[PDB]
Design a protein around this ligand. Structure first.
Ligand SMILES: *[C@@H]1O[C@H](CO)[C@@H](O[C@@H]2O[C@H](CO)[C@@H](O[C@@H]3O[C@H](CO[C@H]4O[C@H](CO)[C@@H](O)[C@H](O)[C@@H]4O)[C@@H](O)[C@H](O[C@H]4O[C@H](CO)[C@@H](O)[C@H](O)[C@@H]4O[C@H]4O[C@H](CO)[C@@H](O)[C@H](O)[C@@H]4O)[C@@H]3O)[C@H](O)[C@H]2NC(C)=O)[C@H](O)[C@H]1NC(C)=O
Ligand SMILES: *[C@@H]1O[C@H](CO)[C@@H](O[C@@H]2O[C@H](CO)[C@@H](O[C@@H]3O[C@H](CO[C@H]4O[C@H](CO)[C@@H](O)[C@H](O[C@H]5O[C@H](CO)[C@@H](O)[C@H](O)[C@@H]5O)[C@@H]4O)[C@@H](O)[C@H](O[C@H]4O[C@H](CO)[C@@H](O)[C@H](O)[C@@H]4O)[C@@H]3O)[C@H](O)[C@H]2NC(C)=O)[C@H](O)[C@H]1NC(C)=O
Ligand SMILES: *[C@@H]1O[C@H](CO)[C@@H](O[C@@H]2O[C@H](CO)[C@@H](O[C@@H]3O[C@H](CO[C@H]4O[C@H](CO)[C@@H](O)[C@H](O)[C@@H]4O)[C@@H](O)[C@H](O[C@H]4O[C@H](CO)[C@@H](O)[C@H](O)[C@@H]4O)[C@@H]3O)[C@H](O)[C@H]2NC(C)=O)[C@H](O)[C@H]1NC(C)=O
Ligand SMILES: *[C@@H]1O[C@H](CO)[C@@H](O[C@@H]2O[C@H](CO)[C@@H](O[C@@H]3O[C@H](CO[C@H]4O[C@H](CO)[C@@H](O)[C@H](O)[C@@H]4O)[C@@H](O)[C@H](O[C@H]4O[C@H](CO)[C@@H](O)[C@H](O)[C@@H]4O)[C@@H]3O)[C@H](O)[C@H]2NC(C)=O)[C@H](O)[C@H]1NC(C)=O
Ligand SMILES: *[C@@H]1O[C@H](CO)[C@@H](O[C@@H]2O[C@H](CO)[C@@H](O)[C@H](O)[C@H]2NC(C)=O)[C@H](O)[C@H]1NC(C)=O
Ligand SMILES: *[C@@H]1O[C@H](CO)[C@@H](O[C@@H]2O[C@H](CO)[C@@H](O)[C@H](O)[C@H]2NC(C)=O)[C@H](O)[C@H]1NC(C)=O
Ligand SMILES: *[C@@H]1O[C@H](CO)[C@@H](O[C@@H]2O[C@H](CO)[C@@H](O)[C@H](O)[C@H]2NC(C)=O)[C@H](O)[C@H]1NC(C)=O
Ligand SMILES: *[C@@H]1O[C@H](CO)[C@@H](O[C@@H]2O[C@H](CO)[C@@H](O)[C@H](O)[C@H]2NC(C)=O)[C@H](O)[C@H]1NC(C)=O
Ligand SMILES: *[C@@H]1O[C@H](CO)[C@@H](O[C@@H]2O[C@H](CO)[C@@H](O)[C@H](O)[C@H]2NC(C)=O)[C@H](O)[C@H]1NC(C)=O
Ligand SMILES: *[C@@H]1O[C@H](CO)[C@@H](O[C@@H]2O[C@H](CO)[C@@H](O)[C@H](O)[C@H]2NC(C)=O)[C@H](O)[C@H]1NC(C)=O
Ligand SMILES: *[C@@H]1O[C@H](CO)[C@@H](O[C@@H]2O[C@H](CO)[C@@H](O)[C@H](O)[C@H]2NC(C)=O)[C@H](O)[C@H]1NC(C)=O
Ligand SMILES: *[C@@H]1O[C@H](CO)[C@@H](O[C@@H]2O[C@H](CO)[C@@H](O)[C@H](O)[C@H]2NC(C)=O)[C@H](O)[C@H]1NC(C)=O
Ligand SMILES: *[C@@H]1O[C@H](CO)[C@@H](O[C@@H]2O[C@H](CO)[C@@H](O)[C@H](O)[C@H]2NC(C)=O)[C@H](O)[C@H]1NC(C)=O
Ligand SMILES: *[C@@H]1O[C@H](CO)[C@@H](O[C@@H]2O[C@H](CO)[C@@H](O)[C@H](O)[C@H]2NC(C)=O)[C@H](O)[C@H]1NC(C)=O
Ligand SMILES: *[C@@H]1O[C@H](CO)[C@@H](O)[C@H](O)[C@H]1NC(C)=O
Ligand SMILES: *[C@@H]1O[C@H](CO)[C@@H](O)[C@H](O)[C@H]1NC(C)=O
Ligand SMILES: *[C@@H]1O[C@H](CO)[C@@H](O)[C@H](O)[C@H]1NC(C)=O
Ligand SMILES: *[C@@H]1O[C@H](CO)[C@@H](O)[C@H](O)[C@H]1NC(C)=O
Ligand SMILES: *[C@@H]1O[C@H](CO)[C@@H](O)[C@H](O)[C@H]1NC(C)=O
Ligand SMILES: *[C@@H]1O[C@H](CO)[C@@H](O)[C@H](O)[C@H]1NC(C)=O
Lengths: 122, 242, 449, 122, 51, 51
């Protein structure tokens, strides 16, 4: 078994960092002057957790980790080859380059799910 | 997206100090491998070996299994991704078939079945394995000539005669006039000494508005000649334009 | 042919730079120093029996010790805890009665003005009408006159109504750790020759910091962690002279400070329930609070430091040293607390030097003692240090300096003007980051029909 | 694309309001005198969110949006035709009329899931 | 004292004349009509509204 | 608005010893008998920085 550790694959190649995806999710939750400090932090924890979980829910995924969708890769989103990415780059690098167009993709991945559900049922 | 620096090298006898260095810029120095290759006029392009700066694993060709040693240095960061390192190579047992330019070239990407295949190349350091002694360059100025009377185009340059070994560098105005430059190869005479020429093409209307300083630098002899090329020509087909 | 499709990824190792609301951590042994809440912990979560660090291999991140937040955070926190500890304690609002003072009982040596004073005053009793004639002694710094034959008043009565610290709490700096909430991270730069700013080559990740104790002092950072290889200096702008030059040590220079006078604590009741803890008579000889530092060790460490100055000011230059220019006690002297009293120690003795390089002995130090402190810009409070009964001796490591600099040659002067730098001394290794595990990527995959 | 907005389909016909179901779910979470106010509100947000999410979980659905079940429509729950509802009524109207019998249906939709799971496995 | 600082008034600099308020008569004489116009829609088409 | 109101005055200065008896006169003027004198000029005993 390969267990580099929490965030241990932040500097490894993105393909190699796909191998460790359960460790980061595990420790994300980690379930009177000091009291207000501690409590405030402990609320922002569950809020930061439930925002990303909410998104992962309304994209139809709901299922933890890698999830596919039928959205086409608009090549203008940093056009490189696949071997040019998953054998080379790291996730910080990657999300930096994609950071510009990220929000648009989050918006698109919203709407397509819904129609699927709707007419899927019916 | 960065360019790799390659270190120019001295002519050397069958025995003398031998090393060539290579610098880097604009990439993460410890991901990509480092491949070495040498092109001689007798045996073609031959791969020598490669080494990774992160691990240190060198795989050499059996043709260099016991006479070449490769080395890498430590990385000096700039930002969170880019960095700046270096790497040397010392090829011992200097035979004459080693005469000829040679290079550095790093790997393509960090993982896969093609981790190290050389994607990004360097500038080129040139050897001359020779017992023959060093010789300085005779830098003569070449007179401008008419390339087109109707279009108003001429040409002027410098002539580097009788130097050994290869190469000799030739610049212009300490690096100001690079447009229109054409440097020709050096031929080796029947004696052991080379000779090349060089000519930049500039318009005929520029006489007292631009200074032309050909800077011939020869490193093995430690000489820098700064010749001033005259913008007044001697061709009877260009005199019609002045 | 193939067209790429976005795929959604959870738990991707991607963070972003940010700040947040951090929280303490105490050693399990520390919750057994009970002493009725030694200042911080009473309510703090224990530290992990099995702490871990994860070395982020291949990772590079750009620190900035000056543009940190846990320094601003820690500094405001120490203040908050400070006022919170004094909210329930005893206020000296009727202790501004006029005082009648004399110099202390001795064969005065005219040169010494008499560091203490013996004073009678009228105090209210457990009943609002009847009053007393109690006597107490005060240090020279606490009192100031108005001109009967002679008189005095406390120096705090014209600035702010003060509160006495309960003599129940302790001021001991215990190792406090700063841990991050869930979905957050703290990055530890494991680089020996780290000058605080820029890309740290080898970075590790940790939830909580190593035990950092709140040792608060000026011109001298005490009891902290030394540098690993060479005494490396840290400064925002080495060129801009107006910026303090934080210096970290490689060897802990040893300092022994005491106050020899065996003392009296007479509990003067100014009722009801309120109990002023006055000083009483003196038991034994009279001789001030002093500090001892081995001359040889310091004469060697100073060389080790100037050796690292020349890497900033030319291969061959001359570095002189002088004492503070001018200002309050908190700035020009070695303000610190040890065992319950607040020393202000002259720093002129150590800074005697001039650097020309291209047996047993000590350098004794002369400290004044204060009780009514006004620490901090004006936001600590004014607080009466309850007098300590007995002889107070403490041994400490010195781990750094807070220097300043004044163009033939250049001289250095001790600063320590602001208290945030004290935290920036040991808080330079750490930065805070948000965890954002929503990694979208392309792959050759379509969702099922 | 049709994006009327958050709650924009509250007055449209229920069939038409089925078209916009991702927008309302998106903005539901929206991830010292003032401090206690703000914080209290921010807790009741995640509580109101996790109650409905808990229900949507223990009905076996778990999957956001429209979800089917094998419960028979007891006609006494405001018997109208289908064309009489999904071409005519609006969701406020609807939940008003169904509000009476709502709780019973929530109770039934509980128990049937469990048996399904149990014997489904086994 | 201590620290407590009452901010008293001191002597007066200049003449004495109270605090006053100014409202244009015409504008108010028009707005009041605009308001009574909306009272009559509550108190009969033709009534008298004193102030 | 009330909560914020008291919260803004909790750390400020209390006038509990400002209830000392006052000795007042009408203000410095050529009094016009009709006006009673809207202000008053008053001496009082106040505690100093010392009790
Ligand atoms: C830099 O770092 C150094 C070392 O880390 C530090 O020096 C330390 O100084 C402090 C005080 O200045 C020392 O603390 C004192 O320790 C002893 C007793 O401790 C031991 O006692 C038992 C005996 O069996 C041991 O088993 C046990 O393990 C302890 O280690 C005493 O001299 C002190 O006790 C009194 O003071 C404290 C409150 O201030 C309490 O710990 C204690 O309850 C005592 O208070 C009592 O005093 C009143 C006097 O009348 C009494 O009436 C009350 O009942 C009241 O309760 C004190 O604990 C510490 O030992 C030093 N370091 C070491 C290694 O020993 C420097 O101070 C630091 N630099 C700075 C600037 O702080
Ligand atoms: C930090 O970043 C660095 C650089 O980015 C990472 O180092 C690189 O890791 C990748 C793997 O992700 C390496 O790619 C592999 O390369 C190996 C090595 O080639 C073989 O040949 C060498 C010369 O003949 C020999 O010296 C090598 O020996 C090593 O291997 C073993 C132990 O593993 C042992 O002999 C030694 O101790 C050496 O360590 C080695 O035998 C190659 O085998 C791989 O090919 C297989 O795998 C790929 C998929 O990865 C597959 O597609 C192929 O078909 C084949 O099956 C693979 O190419 C790379 O060489 C490393 N170095 C670089 C790029 O310079 C490092 O991993 C990062 N750290 C972390 C924690 O992620
Ligand atoms: C700071 O200043 C205060 C002043 O307020 C000093 O407090 C005084 O200290 C002096 C000592 O210097 C005290 O004087 C002593 O009082 C003792 C108690 O007296 C009681 O008993 C006697 C009879 O035994 C009665 O007459 C009297 O009314 C009391 O009921 C006496 O016993 C002492 O006598 C001794 O000294 C004299 C000195 O001449 C000898 O001749 C005697 O034989 C005997 O040995 C002495 O008189 C005084 O009482 C204290 N007053 C208060 C209010 O405390 C502090 O000492 C001083 N501290 C410092 C550090 O400067
Ligand atoms: C509210 O009521 C208070 C009363 O408490 C008034 O305060 C007093 O105001 C009067 C002015 O009306 C002050 O009287 C003036 O005092 C000045 C200062 O005197 C000092 O210097 C002189 C010598 O120069 C010394 O003798 C004296 O002891 C002080 O040390 C004088 O300079 C003034 O003299 C001028 O006026 C007289 C008037 O006859 C002329 O003849 C002189 O030539 C000269 O021009 C004058 O005497 C008084 O000091 C104030 N007292 C206090 C406690 O404030 C407030 O003014 C009042 N306010 C209102 C709005 O009603
Ligand atoms: C900390 O040290 C680094 C290098 O040790 C400094 O970065 C270099 O600073 C010099 C000038 O001082 C520049 O010429 C280099 O280009 C810098 N290198 C990089 C990679 O940026 C850095 O300035 C130092 N900072 C402090 C505050 O000491
Ligand atoms: C403390 O109170 C004493 C009484 O306990 C006061 O003594 C008065 O002193 C004045 C001189 O300033 C005499 O005129 C009085 O006769 C004394 N007795 C009284 C007023 O009862 C005095 O005010 C205070 N002494 C201090 C502070 O030293
Ligand atoms: C003062 O400095 C000395 C170093 O000379 C410290 O002693 C070391 O303490 C660490 C743990 O903090 C141990 O790992 C070392 O082994 C100790 N060294 C020796 C020689 O014993 C001492 O703890 C410091 N005191 C403080 C910081 O209060
Ligand atoms: C400081 O003075 C006090 C006296 O007030 C000393 O306390 C005495 O200590 C001895 C033994 O140490 C006891 O036998 C006495 O009973 C104590 N006297 C009282 C009144 O309690 C104390 O020891 C002195 N401190 C030093 C360091 O000498
Ligand atoms: C600070 O105090 C310590 C302890 O009081 C001194 O160390 C002692 O040194 C002597 C040698 O002179 C040894 O015999 C003792 O064993 C040491 N004590 C301990 C506890 O180690 C130290 O010399 C003092 N330093 C200064 C500058 O005064
Ligand atoms: C720093 O040290 C200098 C001595 O080098 C002090 O200068 C003396 O100041 C006193 C004032 O108390 C004068 O009486 C002396 O004449 C001064 N000596 C000289 C040689 O000028 C200075 O006061 C010290 N300042 C601080 C803040 O420690
Ligand atoms: C700190 O130490 C210096 C020197 O040790 C003191 O300076 C002395 O000041 C007195 C006057 O107050 C002079 O008579 C001496 O000649 C000075 N000494 C020297 C060596 O110049 C200084 O007073 C001490 N205190 C402060 C607050 O600076
Ligand atoms: C710095 O140290 C020197 C010597 O270490 C002190 O110089 C003294 O100067 C006076 C006259 O200026 C001489 O009479 C003394 O003999 C000197 N001292 C010695 C030990 O010889 C100087 O006072 C020190 N400065 C401070 C501020 O303490
Ligand atoms: C209230 O104040 C404003 C401004 O002081 C007055 O408006 C001014 O009217 C004059 C004409 O009389 C103009 O010339 C100024 O330009 C106006 N000033 C501004 C800032 O617009 C206004 O008349 C006052 N109203 C009343 C009722 O007193
Ligand atoms: C304010 O205090 C003054 C003293 O500063 C007091 O003046 C006393 O007035 C009474 C008459 O009411 C005389 O009998 C006393 O002789 C005065 N002097 C004293 C008591 O020392 C007076 O009580 C106050 N005056 C006011 C409030 O106007
Ligand atoms: C796809 O990329 C192109 C590249 O210019 C961009 O103009 C276009 O807006 C992108 N598609 C959408 C839907 O935004
Ligand atoms: C107290 O000490 C001061 C110090 O300057 C001295 O001038 C004064 O005479 C002393 N008073 C005494 C001993 O009563
Ligand atoms: C440092 O100081 C110099 C002059 O004091 C100033 O020009 C510069 O901008 C400052 N900051 C740097 C060098 O980052
Ligand atoms: C010791 O101090 C003296 C002056 O106090 C200085 O001249 C000498 O260089 C110092 N020794 C060393 C080894 O630095
Ligand atoms: C179904 O509807 C009828 C209509 O009267 C009602 O009586 C009955 O209780 C309903 N079924 C259940 C299980 O409640
Ligand atoms: C103060 O004003 C009142 C107002 O009624 C008047 O009756 C009284 O005489 C005035 N006192 C003066 C001017 O001393």
């Amino acid at each position: 078994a390969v267990f580099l550790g929490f965030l241990g694959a932040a500097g490894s190649t993105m393909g190699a960092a796909s191998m460790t995806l359960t460790v980061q999710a595990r420790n994300l939750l980690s379930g009177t002057v000091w009291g207000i400090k501690q409590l405030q932090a402990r609320v922002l924890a569950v809020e930061r957790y439930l925002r990303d979980q909410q998104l992962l829910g309304i994209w139809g995924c709901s299922g933890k980790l890698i999830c596919c969708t039928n959205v086409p890769w608009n090549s203008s989103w940093s056009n490189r080859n696949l071997s040019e990415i998953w054998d080379n780059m790291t996730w910080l690098q990657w999300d930096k380059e994609i950071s510009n167009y990220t929000q648009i993709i989050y918006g698109l991945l919203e709407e397509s799910q819904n129609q699927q559900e709707k007419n899927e049922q019916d | 997206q960065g360019q790799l620096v390659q270190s120019g090298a001295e002519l050397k006898k069958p025995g003398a100090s031998v090393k060539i260095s290579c610098k880097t810029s604009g990439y993460r120095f410890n991901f990509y491998h480092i491949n070495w290759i040498r092109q001689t006029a007798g045996r073609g392009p031959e791969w020598m070996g490669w080494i990774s700066p992160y691990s240190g694993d060198k795989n050499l060709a059996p043709a260099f299994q016991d006479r070449v040693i490769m080395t890498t240095d430590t990385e000096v960061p700039v930002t969170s991704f880019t960095s700046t390192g270096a790497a040397y190579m010392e090829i011992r047992n200097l035979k004459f078939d080693d005469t000829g330019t040679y290079f550095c070239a790093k790997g393509l990407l960090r993982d896969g079945s093609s981790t190290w295949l050389p994607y990004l190349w360097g500038q080129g350091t040139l050897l001359t394995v020779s017992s023959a002694s060093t010789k300085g360059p005779s830098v003569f100025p070449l007179a401008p000539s008419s390339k087109s009377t109707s279009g108003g185009t001429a040409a002027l340059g410098c002539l580097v005669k009788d130097y050994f070994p290869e190469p000799v560098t030739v610049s212009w105005n300490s690096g100001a006039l690079t447009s229109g430059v054409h440097t020709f190869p050096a031929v080796l005479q029947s004696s052991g000494l080379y000779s090349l020429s060089s000519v930049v093409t500039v318009p005929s209307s520029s006489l007292g508005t631009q200074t032309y300083i050909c800077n011939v630098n020869h490193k093995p002899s430690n000489t820098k000649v700064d010749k001033r090329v005259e913008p007044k020509s001697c061709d009877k087909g260009l005199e019609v334009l002045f | 042919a193939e067209n790429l499709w976005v795929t959604v990824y959870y738990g991707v190792p991607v963070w972003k730079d940010a700040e947040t609301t951090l929280f303490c951590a105490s050693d399990a042994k520390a919750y057994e120093t009970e002493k009725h809440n030694v200042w911080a912990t009473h309510a703090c979560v224990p530290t992990d029996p099995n702490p871990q660090e994860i070395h982020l291999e291949n990772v590079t991140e750009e620190f900035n010790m000056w543009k940190n937040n846990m320094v601003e955070q820690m500094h405001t926190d120490i203040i908050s805890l400070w006022d919170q500890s004094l909210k329930p304690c005893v206020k000296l609002t009727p202790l501004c009665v006029t005082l009648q003072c004399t110099n202390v009982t001795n064969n005065i040596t005219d040169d010494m003005r008499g560091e203490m004073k013996n004073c009678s005053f009228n105090m209210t009793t457990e009943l609002r009408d009847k009053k007393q004639k109690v006597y107490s002694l005060f240090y020279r710094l606490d009192v100031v006159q108005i001109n009967s034959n002679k008189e005095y008043r406390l120096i705090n009565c014209n600035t702010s109504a003060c509160t006495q610290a309960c003599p129940k709490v302790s001021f001991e700096p215990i190792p406090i750790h700063y841990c991050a909430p869930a979905g957050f991270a703290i990055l530890k730069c494991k680089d020996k020759k780290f000058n605080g700013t820029g890309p740290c080559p080898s970075v590790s990740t940790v939830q909580c910091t190593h035990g950092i104790k709140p040792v608060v002092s000026t011109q001298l950072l005490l009891n902290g962690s030394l540098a690993e290889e060479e005494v490396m200096i840290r400064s925002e702008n080495i060129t801009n002279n107006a910026k303090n030059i934080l210096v970290q040590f490689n060897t802990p220079v040893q300092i022994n400070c005491t106050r020899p006078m065996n003392m009296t604590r007479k509990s003067i009741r100014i009722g009801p329930g309120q109990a002023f803890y006055a000083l009483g008579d003196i038991i034994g000889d009279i001789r001030q609070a002093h500090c001892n530092v081995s001359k040889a060790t310091w004469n060697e460490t100073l060389g080790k430091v100037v050796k690292q100055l020349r890497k900033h000011f030319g291969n061959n230059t001359i570095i002189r040293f002088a004492n503070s220019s001018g200002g309050d006690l908190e700035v020009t002297t070695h303000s610190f607390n040890c065992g319950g009293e607040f020393f202000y120690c002259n720093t002129s003795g150590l800074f005697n030097s001039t650097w020309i390089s291209n047996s047993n002995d000590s350098i004794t130090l002369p400290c004044r003692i204060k009780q009514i402190i006004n620490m901090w810009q004006r936001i600590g409070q004014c607080m009466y240090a309850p007098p300590i009964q007995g002889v107070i001796r403490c041994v400490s490591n010195i781990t750094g300096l807070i220097l300043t600099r004044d163009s033939t040659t250049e001289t250095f002067r001790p600063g320590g003007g602001d208290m945030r730098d004290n935290w920036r001394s040991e808080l330079y290794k750490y930065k805070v980051v948000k965890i954002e595990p929503l990694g979208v990527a392309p792959t050759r995959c379509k969702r099922r029909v």
